[PDB]
Amino acid sequence: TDSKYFTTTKKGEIFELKAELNSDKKEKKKEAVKKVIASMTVGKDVSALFPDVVNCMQTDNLELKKLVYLYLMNYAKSQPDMAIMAVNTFVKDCEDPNPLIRALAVRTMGCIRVDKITEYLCEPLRKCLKDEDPYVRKTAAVCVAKLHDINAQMVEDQGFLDTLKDLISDSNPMVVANRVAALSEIAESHPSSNLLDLKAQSINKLLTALNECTEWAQIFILDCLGNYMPKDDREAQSICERVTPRLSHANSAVVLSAVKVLMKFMDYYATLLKKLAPPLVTLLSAEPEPQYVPLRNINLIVQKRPEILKHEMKVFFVKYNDPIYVKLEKLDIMIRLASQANIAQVLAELKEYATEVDVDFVRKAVRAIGRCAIKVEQSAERCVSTLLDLIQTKVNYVVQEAIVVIKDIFRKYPNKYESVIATLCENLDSDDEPEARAAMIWIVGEYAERSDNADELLESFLDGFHDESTQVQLQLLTAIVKLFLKKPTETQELVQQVLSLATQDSDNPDLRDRGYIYWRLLSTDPVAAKEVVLAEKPLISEETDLIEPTLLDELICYIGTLASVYHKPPNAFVE
Amino acid sequence: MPAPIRLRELIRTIRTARTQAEEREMIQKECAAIRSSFREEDNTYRCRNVAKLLYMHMLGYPAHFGQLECLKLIASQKFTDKRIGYLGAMLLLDERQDVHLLMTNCIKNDLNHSTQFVQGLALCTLGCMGSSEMCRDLAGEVEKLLKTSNSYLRKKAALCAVHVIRKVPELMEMFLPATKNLLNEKNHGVLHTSVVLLTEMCERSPDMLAHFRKLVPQLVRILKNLIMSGYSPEHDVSGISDPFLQVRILRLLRILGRNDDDSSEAMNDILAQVATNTETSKNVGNAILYETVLTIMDIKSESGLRVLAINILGRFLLNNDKNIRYVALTSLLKTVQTDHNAVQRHRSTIVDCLKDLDVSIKRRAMELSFALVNGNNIRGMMKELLYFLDSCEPEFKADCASGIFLAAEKYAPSKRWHIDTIMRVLTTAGSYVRDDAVPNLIQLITNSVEMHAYTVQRLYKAILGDYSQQPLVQVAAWCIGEYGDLLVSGQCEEEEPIQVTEDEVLDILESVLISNMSTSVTRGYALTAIMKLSTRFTCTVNRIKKVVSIYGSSIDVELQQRAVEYNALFKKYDHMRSALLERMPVMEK
Amino acid sequence: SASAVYVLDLKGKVLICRNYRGDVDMSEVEHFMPILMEKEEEGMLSPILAHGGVRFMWIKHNNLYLVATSKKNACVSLVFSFLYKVVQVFSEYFKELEEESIRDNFVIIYELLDELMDFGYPQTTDSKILQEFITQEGHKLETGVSWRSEGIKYRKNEVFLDVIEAVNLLVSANGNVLRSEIVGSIKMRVFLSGMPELRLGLNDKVELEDVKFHQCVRLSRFENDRTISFIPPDGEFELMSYRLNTHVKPLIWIESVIEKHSHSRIEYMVKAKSQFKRRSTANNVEIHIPVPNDADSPKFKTTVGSVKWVPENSEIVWSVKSFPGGKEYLMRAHFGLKPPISVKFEIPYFTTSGIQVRYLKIIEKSGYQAIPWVRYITQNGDYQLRTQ
Amino acid sequence: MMRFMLLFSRQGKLRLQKWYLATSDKERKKMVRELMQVVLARKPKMCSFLEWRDLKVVYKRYASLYFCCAIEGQDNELITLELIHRYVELLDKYFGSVCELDIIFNFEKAYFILDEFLMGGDVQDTSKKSVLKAIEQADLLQEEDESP
């Protein structure tokens, strides 16, 4: 009543290595181990080997010594239990004469997640720190947080923070960097101590620290200034006249996070704004993926102080190499940035755009022409003019979206465009989309007076009804009515059928209603209905768009942040 | 003048490999030198490389290279070369009739050899490649060999012939000859082969009657003998003799008694025994049963016996370990359409499976369970289906909806329930439900004129907390509209009304439009509805007019349009509102 | 900020990685790929994906998706810069990134990784500024007119480029994919003026059986970056063809349930699901349902489309004009008193394959423009389904 | 009937394939991988039977080694399983407490063994010994070929 084949510790893989591990020649042990981790990562099971591996500990040559480590390393978060069993080995390693080593012993100790860890490492930590080497300090600085984040802190722990700060500004090389952030992150779990970052002296520490190059540092530093500045001017002018190099300097992250503050702090202004210009720009001649985030922020930016690049735009055009998201945002922006002197070019470009091949694009693109005309009333026709201009191309897809837009246009500037109507219908077949068709229809309805044919057009769709997007079924109904109320005597049978279909031959509650509703309005008092339906129609309002006040100010803080992209509050992320 | 590597040696070398690139290297360098070794066609070492190759292949590499030469081994005199060879064939061959003939050749030449294991290779190989033409050739040769009683061979042969049949239906004739005696043999091996041989044979109605009437009784005895006694150091596998043999037997018994009284009527005994007399300990046995059951099913037999069969599967379901349970369900379905009244005796436990952690089971469970929904059943099972549905995983939700609906749509008690349930489902899947729902459910409500209350009621409650959902909300908003009347703490039958402040009715509707979670269509039903209330209430007839006129300016061509429409209705021809709304028509199925 | 970094291979399976913090890692990464794809169906393809409040920062480099993870509100800008840098480093250590590459230097990577950052915050890193912190060296891996006469005319310069894909499939009641084939074709139509060099950029994604171009094509400068430059004849011609082998969840599934007896009547119920990205829809689709040679008289009832019958060929035909993706419609028909069921469709602006034309350039001496139209269609008919 | 069988470890490493039904090489490798992926991919908690491409598949996990095969729907999954366990059985007693490595280094034999256990998609013997006993003497013949 016992069975387990292919599971002998007499031979095979496991064994093979196991032995070849304990041999002599330092070489074997080395390679051997290597295969281990390897053979590990791919997904095999090394639960076994563990022992004999560690016990390949009491050796020396870095080579081996570290490999061993890595191994253990992986086992970090996975099976912490095993990690621990190595403790002693580490502590006792902390003292080793090769900081490199003892440092690793640190970082290592630190990548565990169990409570039992507190006991064994703390003391050695303090030590390792105050000690004498770059890596050493850095590394533990890091740890600190790790310990913090551990499922618990201590009354000693809340005493290491001091170590931090003090040791922070002090020890000089990159170290500080780590320290900084270390704390920063720690801070956010905000009791009090995170709020005493209020020194217009501790700041100069940071000041010279920025010019003491560790990009990552540069950031973390700025990243902190995002918790400051209550009330004074001379300090502002120096804090900022100090960041001026930061922009033209290194890698985005910098420039960005840098800006992140420049704007939380705001003959003063003109200096900033005319400098802030060439930075953001050269920020885009950079790379694909980044470009996004920035644009996203760029957006948020002009939203607050548009005055910054009020005329810089011969750049925000979309090239072909540029990926989709790129393009998208680029648009959204261009838009939030046009006026008279602008539009001239704006359109010129949109037109070409539309000509492109990437569908989606052209779409939002034409749709751009749309929002465009809206913001700049003073440029209505102008747009239209080109819209129409495109449809004359009979490029199936373009066409439809186009119309759609035009529709919306009419909603805002009624009885101002007509002639365009006939020229419109022209392409009636080629329109196979919902809203597209829909829209089209509803249009006819409204401006029925003009088109004689009105009838058949609408009619056309009928025979092929009982099936077409809900929404379209609607207007179509509505519309019909409309012209019927333009009194045509010839409308009888039509309207009749219409309702009729949308009366009993249809199975969409809502529909049935708006349907019946009319059937009663008419079966009772035409004159009445007339005024009713085609009644003086109100003005439209989609001011619901283009960011808010309270919210705007608040966001700018998180540039280079996730929020920096969603344009939303940490409340939606945090879970 | 080379120094040829040896197989293992090779591999062991690829074990040293540190980089995929390198692997190529080594390999490429190997086969390269190996090719230049075949240039000469040197009889010795021939075997080796072929192997080397084999391996090479196995690791997904340039194989074709030596298909041919592989055969040139088969040629060789020395056994070895032949086995290594043959093996290589089965692996590296494309079905070229050309080699196929060369194959044929060597097969025969080998099939008639002084030694015997040679003959082994042959047979074997032939039963694994045998392409039409082949068989059409060696066919007879197979019989000549089928005869000679050297157990080892015979069994091999048997199977061969089989394979032949499979590729050349036309020839089973010449095998009638081996037939008659076969089922009397003593060595399991053969016997077994012999069986499937027979089994496969019976794919031509006539032969049936031959074996049908013949061997049936005998088969029995054999099987019986087995089951019934002794432990066997040669055959047992955890307490039973040659399960295999046992199974296959069953199978054959099964197939024979397909549709017939005589046969069956003559089997039901051994069967029953097989059932009662076997060990439920571990799988092995159960395997036995699994088969026995299937057999017991396709064949006519006392109502009492079939009953046992079923009750047996149930017995499975309740087994600690997955596996088993699977088939348990599977087969179960294939018979629900037949032994309905019989299986029912277990649903309770079946649906109880839905609680399992394995998709397959789940589904099947479901599928079936469903099917068992009776009349007097529904209520219960539904209550369970519902619990289920609610916590289910996406995949399923979708399909179940469809399911429940059915149930209710067909076998179904009260509307209140029907609705209650349908709604219920919406409440949980909606986002997954098909399209016709919205109208569906309403049509149900409208048609049955009582629960009008009970409905708007619950409808209301649900919507108060929830928002997430569309179909649901819609439906509600609907009635709320058309039914506001009744929604006002009315003299409600079927059950207990609640607090209906018109202000509240609105608050909800209002939020609906505002909150971003609703579709333009949604907002529709709403607004429209809100107005339907103007005629259906007594006092807040003002907050109403306010809203309407505000929406008169919304992006939604529709909403607006209507808004204006309504708006204007108040502003001018009031009293029409009363007659206009107060009447919702009614469509009937 | 960043709490995890992975490195995957196209497939989206975890290739090799390191965990610098505390998030159920084990899962999420797995969901990656799946999500990715869907969010590409919505076109709303963002380098920042979402799953339950878990964000993904990624970058695709030849053959390898590189990714980051965070529960908190990250400093994106970073992560992105960093990641990209990560490449920088590797590519330097051994010639080029590629599954293969990684598959080799695992170890060192584990090292490198560790020294590149810690607990998230990246303790700085640049090549030389590092080679001291790294144990051993890694292994590198370096690898590798006449058809248009001349002086052509016509006032309006225009172009037509149409890619089409038909989908041959077979599935038995056992709801399994049996054959997965989609033949593609980039037919093109043109009437440009003169001699214009045409540059065509492509989607990435395009296991693959055969691929044949038209001589007039050239593969844009050696490696991995897809660009298809060439000079087209006049009129119509096939720019390129190809066949793929891939489990394509049956675009338009179906399944018929049966129910017969009492007064020699029989009932059919057919569900027809549309397995697609919701955003688009299939056209002029039609369903051919096999039925008994000897029906008496039918009675169809359906929410959608119109169904009809034809004793000849013995089949009930469900016809639908427009059909959206992601929705299931129901058809049920009875009558009174086995060949596989097929259907033919058409789906504008769609590519089962997954390609998308990226961009079409036109460069001519005549500093002019031109008008290019595209169309994507996934039709076909070998769409056959069984019933035993 | 058996449609075919394979031997691969956790990671998609083919250790032994054997096809019982004519087929083009390409299609094979296809079959292979296509399966392996969807095969392995499953949690150890789940079951041992899957319905794939019309056929019924089966497998049992032996340490870092997978055993798979396909059957015709009209067949007994369970019993099949017991077959595998039988093969392994053989393998074991032949190499003495067998293990993966072995299989990689001696597939050849692995085949023979198997090959002379199952033929044309079925069971040729059951006798744990019948097979061994035979397979053994065969080997003796082999030896006698190099060493006269």
PDB file of C-alpha atoms in Angstrom, chain A residues 34 37 41-42 63 66-67 70 73-74 77 100 104 107 111 135 138-139 142 145-146 149 174 178 181 185 214-216 219-220 223 251-253 256 287 289-290 292-293 320-321 324-325 355-360 364 393-397 437 466 468 558 560-563 566 570 572-573 575, chain C residues 16 18-19 21 43-48 50 52-53 55 57-60 70-78 80-82 84-85 103 106-107 110-111 114-115 117-119 121-125 133 135-136 199 279 302-303 305 321 349 356-361 369-374 376:
ATOM      1  CA  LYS A  34      25.069  28.451 -11.007  1.00  0.00           C
ATOM      2  CA  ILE A  37      19.587  29.019  -9.458  1.00  0.00           C
ATOM      3  CA  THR A  41      14.186  30.040 -12.120  1.00  0.00           C
ATOM      4  CA  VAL A  42      12.867  27.993 -14.993  1.00  0.00           C
ATOM      5  CA  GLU A  63      32.593  34.314  -6.783  1.00  0.00           C
ATOM      6  CA  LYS A  66      27.817  35.785  -3.688  1.00  0.00           C
ATOM      7  CA  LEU A  67      26.233  33.212  -5.934  1.00  0.00           C
ATOM      8  CA  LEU A  70      21.608  35.185  -4.993  1.00  0.00           C
ATOM      9  CA  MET A  73      17.870  35.804  -2.484  1.00  0.00           C
ATOM     10  CA  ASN A  74      15.247  34.280  -4.773  1.00  0.00           C
ATOM     11  CA  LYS A  77       9.679  36.391  -0.663  1.00  0.00           C
ATOM     12  CA  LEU A 100      30.788  44.631  -0.374  1.00  0.00           C
ATOM     13  CA  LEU A 104      24.927  42.350   0.693  1.00  0.00           C
ATOM     14  CA  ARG A 107      20.241  44.310   1.650  1.00  0.00           C
ATOM     15  CA  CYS A 111      14.424  41.508   1.701  1.00  0.00           C
ATOM     16  CA  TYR A 135      27.140  50.916  -0.467  1.00  0.00           C
ATOM     17  CA  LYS A 138      23.014  53.421   1.181  1.00  0.00           C
ATOM     18  CA  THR A 139      21.798  49.919   1.264  1.00  0.00           C
ATOM     19  CA  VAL A 142      17.028  51.475   2.102  1.00  0.00           C
ATOM     20  CA  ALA A 145      11.964  51.436   5.075  1.00  0.00           C
ATOM     21  CA  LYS A 146      11.811  47.688   4.591  1.00  0.00           C
ATOM     22  CA  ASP A 149       7.014  48.593   6.177  1.00  0.00           C
ATOM     23  CA  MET A 174      24.721  59.373  -3.580  1.00  0.00           C
ATOM     24  CA  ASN A 178      18.698  56.734  -0.858  1.00  0.00           C
ATOM     25  CA  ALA A 181      13.514  58.895  -0.408  1.00  0.00           C
ATOM     26  CA  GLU A 185       8.275  57.036   1.519  1.00  0.00           C
ATOM     27  CA  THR A 214      22.408  61.028  -8.774  1.00  0.00           C
ATOM     28  CA  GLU A 215      19.459  61.666 -11.089  1.00  0.00           C
ATOM     29  CA  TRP A 216      17.400  59.378  -8.896  1.00  0.00           C
ATOM     30  CA  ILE A 219      14.224  63.440  -7.985  1.00  0.00           C
ATOM     31  CA  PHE A 220      13.593  62.162  -4.474  1.00  0.00           C
ATOM     32  CA  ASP A 223       9.845  64.748  -4.791  1.00  0.00           C
ATOM     33  CA  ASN A 251      16.743  62.757 -18.120  1.00  0.00           C
ATOM     34  CA  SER A 252      13.114  63.557 -18.227  1.00  0.00           C
ATOM     35  CA  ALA A 253      12.412  62.204 -14.699  1.00  0.00           C
ATOM     36  CA  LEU A 256       9.673  66.522 -14.896  1.00  0.00           C
ATOM     37  CA  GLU A 287      11.259  58.840 -26.470  1.00  0.00           C
ATOM     38  CA  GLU A 289       6.678  55.681 -24.023  1.00  0.00           C
ATOM     39  CA  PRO A 290       7.820  58.742 -22.037  1.00  0.00           C
ATOM     40  CA  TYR A 292       2.921  59.887 -23.208  1.00  0.00           C
ATOM     41  CA  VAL A 293       3.128  60.727 -19.504  1.00  0.00           C
ATOM     42  CA  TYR A 320       3.675  59.059 -38.846  1.00  0.00           C
ATOM     43  CA  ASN A 321       6.275  57.071 -36.871  1.00  0.00           C
ATOM     44  CA  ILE A 324      -1.324  55.663 -31.354  1.00  0.00           C
ATOM     45  CA  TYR A 325      -1.440  56.862 -27.771  1.00  0.00           C
ATOM     46  CA  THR A 355      -5.996  61.634 -45.159  1.00  0.00           C
ATOM     47  CA  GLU A 356      -3.816  59.131 -43.236  1.00  0.00           C
ATOM     48  CA  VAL A 357      -4.470  55.373 -42.918  1.00  0.00           C
ATOM     49  CA  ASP A 358      -4.701  54.683 -39.239  1.00  0.00           C
ATOM     50  CA  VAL A 359      -8.448  54.684 -38.844  1.00  0.00           C
ATOM     51  CA  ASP A 360      -9.078  55.366 -35.190  1.00  0.00           C
ATOM     52  CA  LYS A 364     -10.716  61.380 -33.238  1.00  0.00           C
ATOM     53  CA  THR A 393     -13.623  62.661 -51.268  1.00  0.00           C
ATOM     54  CA  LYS A 394     -16.181  59.934 -50.803  1.00  0.00           C
ATOM     55  CA  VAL A 395     -13.654  58.130 -48.632  1.00  0.00           C
ATOM     56  CA  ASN A 396     -16.225  55.883 -47.002  1.00  0.00           C
ATOM     57  CA  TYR A 397     -15.207  56.053 -43.302  1.00  0.00           C
ATOM     58  CA  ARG A 437     -26.794  57.145 -39.977  1.00  0.00           C
ATOM     59  CA  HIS A 466     -37.537  46.412 -37.001  1.00  0.00           C
ATOM     60  CA  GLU A 468     -31.297  49.015 -36.756  1.00  0.00           C
ATOM     61  CA  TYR A 558       1.755  65.069  -8.616  1.00  0.00           C
ATOM     62  CA  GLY A 560       5.327  62.586 -13.131  1.00  0.00           C
ATOM     63  CA  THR A 561       2.763  60.657 -11.116  1.00  0.00           C
ATOM     64  CA  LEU A 562       0.185  58.069 -12.071  1.00  0.00           C
ATOM     65  CA  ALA A 563      -2.378  60.627 -11.157  1.00  0.00           C
ATOM     66  CA  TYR A 566      -5.194  59.784 -15.225  1.00  0.00           C
ATOM     67  CA  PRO A 570      -4.989  59.232  -5.270  1.00  0.00           C
ATOM     68  CA  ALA A 572      -9.152  56.161  -7.032  1.00  0.00           C
ATOM     69  CA  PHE A 573      -5.810  54.369  -6.912  1.00  0.00           C
ATOM     70  CA  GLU A 575      -6.935  50.433  -2.466  1.00  0.00           C
TER      71      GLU A 575
ATOM     72  CA  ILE C  16      12.512  35.709 -15.480  1.00  0.00           C
ATOM     73  CA  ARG C  18      12.724  39.770  -9.284  1.00  0.00           C
ATOM     74  CA  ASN C  19      10.389  40.870  -6.468  1.00  0.00           C
ATOM     75  CA  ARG C  21       8.492  44.543  -2.411  1.00  0.00           C
ATOM     76  CA  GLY C  43      -7.715  50.730 -29.323  1.00  0.00           C
ATOM     77  CA  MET C  44      -7.280  52.449 -25.939  1.00  0.00           C
ATOM     78  CA  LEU C  45      -3.851  50.818 -25.936  1.00  0.00           C
ATOM     79  CA  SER C  46      -1.968  52.442 -23.030  1.00  0.00           C
ATOM     80  CA  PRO C  47       1.546  51.718 -21.649  1.00  0.00           C
ATOM     81  CA  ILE C  48      -0.175  51.726 -18.236  1.00  0.00           C
ATOM     82  CA  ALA C  50      -5.158  48.241 -15.073  1.00  0.00           C
ATOM     83  CA  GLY C  52      -8.028  45.558  -9.701  1.00  0.00           C
ATOM     84  CA  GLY C  53      -5.885  48.533  -8.729  1.00  0.00           C
ATOM     85  CA  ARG C  55      -0.805  49.107 -12.652  1.00  0.00           C
ATOM     86  CA  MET C  57       4.381  49.869 -16.866  1.00  0.00           C
ATOM     87  CA  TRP C  58       5.834  48.146 -19.889  1.00  0.00           C
ATOM     88  CA  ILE C  59       8.063  48.415 -22.908  1.00  0.00           C
ATOM     89  CA  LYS C  60       8.421  45.968 -25.722  1.00  0.00           C
ATOM     90  CA  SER C  70       2.967  48.974  -8.256  1.00  0.00           C
ATOM     91  CA  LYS C  71       0.012  49.177  -5.895  1.00  0.00           C
ATOM     92  CA  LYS C  72       0.761  52.746  -4.825  1.00  0.00           C
ATOM     93  CA  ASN C  73       0.774  55.914  -6.942  1.00  0.00           C
ATOM     94  CA  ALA C  74       4.003  55.571  -8.926  1.00  0.00           C
ATOM     95  CA  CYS C  75       6.381  58.183 -10.276  1.00  0.00           C
ATOM     96  CA  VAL C  76       5.834  56.783 -13.769  1.00  0.00           C
ATOM     97  CA  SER C  77       8.308  59.097 -15.466  1.00  0.00           C
ATOM     98  CA  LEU C  78      10.866  57.155 -13.477  1.00  0.00           C
ATOM     99  CA  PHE C  80       9.657  54.256 -17.657  1.00  0.00           C
ATOM    100  CA  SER C  81      13.070  55.963 -17.873  1.00  0.00           C
ATOM    101  CA  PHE C  82      14.551  53.321 -15.631  1.00  0.00           C
ATOM    102  CA  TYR C  84      14.301  51.628 -20.786  1.00  0.00           C
ATOM    103  CA  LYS C  85      17.697  52.194 -19.162  1.00  0.00           C
ATOM    104  CA  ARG C 103      17.670  32.441 -21.264  1.00  0.00           C
ATOM    105  CA  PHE C 106      20.080  34.410 -16.056  1.00  0.00           C
ATOM    106  CA  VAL C 107      22.422  34.462 -13.171  1.00  0.00           C
ATOM    107  CA  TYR C 110      19.743  38.320 -11.082  1.00  0.00           C
ATOM    108  CA  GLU C 111      22.887  40.112  -9.990  1.00  0.00           C
ATOM    109  CA  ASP C 114      19.807  43.471  -7.549  1.00  0.00           C
ATOM    110  CA  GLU C 115      22.429  46.173  -7.955  1.00  0.00           C
ATOM    111  CA  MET C 117      17.732  49.104  -7.610  1.00  0.00           C
ATOM    112  CA  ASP C 118      16.434  48.156  -4.203  1.00  0.00           C
ATOM    113  CA  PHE C 119      13.014  47.873  -2.555  1.00  0.00           C
ATOM    114  CA  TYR C 121      13.964  53.091  -5.316  1.00  0.00           C
ATOM    115  CA  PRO C 122      16.786  52.492  -7.755  1.00  0.00           C
ATOM    116  CA  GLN C 123      20.173  52.914  -6.165  1.00  0.00           C
ATOM    117  CA  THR C 124      21.674  54.497  -9.309  1.00  0.00           C
ATOM    118  CA  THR C 125      23.205  52.571 -12.141  1.00  0.00           C
ATOM    119  CA  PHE C 133      29.727  45.526  -8.318  1.00  0.00           C
ATOM    120  CA  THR C 135      30.632  39.123 -10.059  1.00  0.00           C
ATOM    121  CA  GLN C 136      31.057  37.472 -13.410  1.00  0.00           C
ATOM    122  CA  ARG C 199       6.988  53.143 -47.816  1.00  0.00           C
ATOM    123  CA  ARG C 279     -16.278  47.728 -30.513  1.00  0.00           C
ATOM    124  CA  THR C 302     -36.762  35.264 -34.049  1.00  0.00           C
ATOM    125  CA  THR C 303     -35.770  38.462 -32.367  1.00  0.00           C
ATOM    126  CA  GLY C 305     -32.833  38.771 -38.721  1.00  0.00           C
ATOM    127  CA  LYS C 321     -28.052  41.813 -41.994  1.00  0.00           C
ATOM    128  CA  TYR C 349     -12.307  47.026 -40.271  1.00  0.00           C
ATOM    129  CA  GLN C 356      -3.227  46.815 -38.501  1.00  0.00           C
ATOM    130  CA  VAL C 357      -1.634  48.865 -41.210  1.00  0.00           C
ATOM    131  CA  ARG C 358       0.446  51.406 -39.379  1.00  0.00           C
ATOM    132  CA  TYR C 359       1.122  54.079 -42.007  1.00  0.00           C
ATOM    133  CA  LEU C 360       1.455  54.667 -45.720  1.00  0.00           C
ATOM    134  CA  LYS C 361       4.049  57.059 -47.093  1.00  0.00           C
ATOM    135  CA  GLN C 369      -0.199  64.603 -52.191  1.00  0.00           C
ATOM    136  CA  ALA C 370      -2.286  61.567 -52.847  1.00  0.00           C
ATOM    137  CA  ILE C 371      -5.344  59.870 -51.476  1.00  0.00           C
ATOM    138  CA  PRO C 372      -4.984  56.484 -49.760  1.00  0.00           C
ATOM    139  CA  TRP C 373      -8.007  54.314 -48.685  1.00  0.00           C
ATOM    140  CA  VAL C 374      -7.885  51.188 -46.668  1.00  0.00           C
ATOM    141  CA  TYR C 376     -10.009  45.451 -43.600  1.00  0.00           C
TER     142      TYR C 376
END
